Amino acid sequence: HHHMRVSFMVAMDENRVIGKDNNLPWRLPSELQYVKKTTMGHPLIMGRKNYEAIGRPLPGRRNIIVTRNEGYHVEGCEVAHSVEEVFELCKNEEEIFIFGGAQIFDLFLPYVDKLYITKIHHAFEGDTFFPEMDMTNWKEVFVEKGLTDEKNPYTYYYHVYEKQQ
């Protein structure tokens, strides 16, 4: 019924860890560069907790915050309270990026068309996970090794998957 591409944008470790103590368990500025370039010009859909840890709108993109709080407001951002309200806000968009965290990934899981996953080859301590997905009917359409150096101290790969049917 919705006409936008619904894409997930996530970085996770060997055990699907995405967070520890309401923050990111790793610092990978080069991974952040990839995220910025990939998502630029497209709406970012984020759970309230994800957004609040950021604390400011990310420039050049529609920032849409998902919350059950019907009195929630933040300047420079739009607020939605359900999947359908996100779909109404983004009805004429080409592609939107579900940007996390875990509760918001779970929420949009039935609707994902395309997956941009950074896979980090380390096992971090963590408490928040990317949902399991059955990847049948999914095709890897891109893979490349991430930049590992003094500023980016882990091995990681960018993967992109597209849903077939």
Ligand X SMILES: COc1cc([C@@H](C#Cc2c(C)nc(N)nc2N)OC)cc(OC)c1OC
Asked whether residue 92 is marked as a ligand-binding residue, the answer is no
In the region spanning residues 47 to 76, those forming contacts with ligand NDP, defined by CB under 6 A, are: 47-50, 53, 66-69
Place of tokens 């990026």: 97
Instruction: With contacts defined by CB under 8 A, name the span among 41-49, 64-72, 79-87, 154-162 that binds a copy of itself.
Output: 154-162
Whose Cβ is closer to ligand NDP: residue 5's or residue 81's?
A: 81
| Cβ-Cβ contacts under 8 Å for 127 (sequence gap 6 or more) | 19, 20, 21
SS3 (DSSP) at 71:
coil
Peptide bond into 101 cis (omega under 30): yes
Residue 108 is a binding residue for ligand NDP (CB under 6 A):
no
Q: Give CA–CA dist 99/76, Å, rounded.
A: 17
Smallest separation (angstroms) from a copy of itself to the CB of 155: 8
Residue 123 contacts which entry, a copy of itself, ligand X, ligand NDP, none (Cβ below 5-8 A, type-dependent): none
Write out the E strands in the chain: 5-13, 17-19, 44-47, 63-66, 78-80, 95-100, 114-120, 128-129, 138-145, 156-163
Residue 54 contacts which entry, a copy of itself, ligand X, ligand NDP, none (Cβ below 5-8 A, type-dependent): ligand X
In the region spanning residues 78 to 137, those forming contacts with a copy of itself, defined by CB under 8 A, are: 135-137
Residues placed in the known binding site for NADP(+):
11, 18, 23, 48-50, 67-68, 101-104
